[PDB]
Amino acid sequence: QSMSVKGRIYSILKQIGSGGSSKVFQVLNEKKQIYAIKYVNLEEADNQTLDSYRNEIAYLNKLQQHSDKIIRLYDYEITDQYIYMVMECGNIDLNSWLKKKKSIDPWERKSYWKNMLEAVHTIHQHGIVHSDLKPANFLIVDGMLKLIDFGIANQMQPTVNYMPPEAIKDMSKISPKSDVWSLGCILYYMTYGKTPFQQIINQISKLHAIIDPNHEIEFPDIPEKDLQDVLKCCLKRDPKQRISIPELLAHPYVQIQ
């Protein structure tokens, strides 16, 4: 019902999600201001998993200054038993919002796409490749999309649909082009209401369809135009032929209108 971080006291209202050892809570400080606290239990954690939480917290701190499209971290407490992270509170995650919302506005979709690109470009500049991008990694904070995690530490829950073909074939990798494919799948969902390989239920057959070059991804005609070109450029199976993020930021879809 109550917890202490550094010196400040916070009162728990409700739980948002869990990730094995991790937990996210909606809190309030002494001045009745809303915040989000991530609690990580380290009692069962090993030397490899401990260093992965140490690495993601360090990058979250450094990248605060570099972009406003990355979640805000205010303070943290790290001991041998736990981790407490005082972060900003979002309205909803992108996945929970996408499932509830039927039709999406084209001006809202265009705005969200630019936000995702800005956030993923920042981590790439610092040599980070997420490699597990999905809508749940993005948070809606006052009509703006912010990136929650960097994929260094372990994931959380409140799918193989966003996996690039090169990851499956690698059984010396990978490149920032892998995140471009995953981002493309999120945009394809915001455009057609389904992921490029959602139709296949059998996971063995679905994985074969992603790597198969003869398998043609469906691109139905829509009033937009530059949007259809982005989708075809992001969803290219060859990463060397796939579009880059600096190129995407200069594309007519992102710059014109």
Ligand SMILES: CCOc1cc(-c2nncn2C)ccc1Nc1ncc2cc(C)nc(NCC(C)(C)C)c2n1
């Ligand atoms: C006050 C409203 O709070 C939320 C309600 C919903 C939600 N609405 N319907 C369903 N859900 C889950 C979703 C998100 C938030 N805000 C939030 N803020 C800050 C957050 C920080 C972190 C590190 N992880 C969150 N979330 C984890 C998840 C993606 C795994 C959920 C965070 N979540």
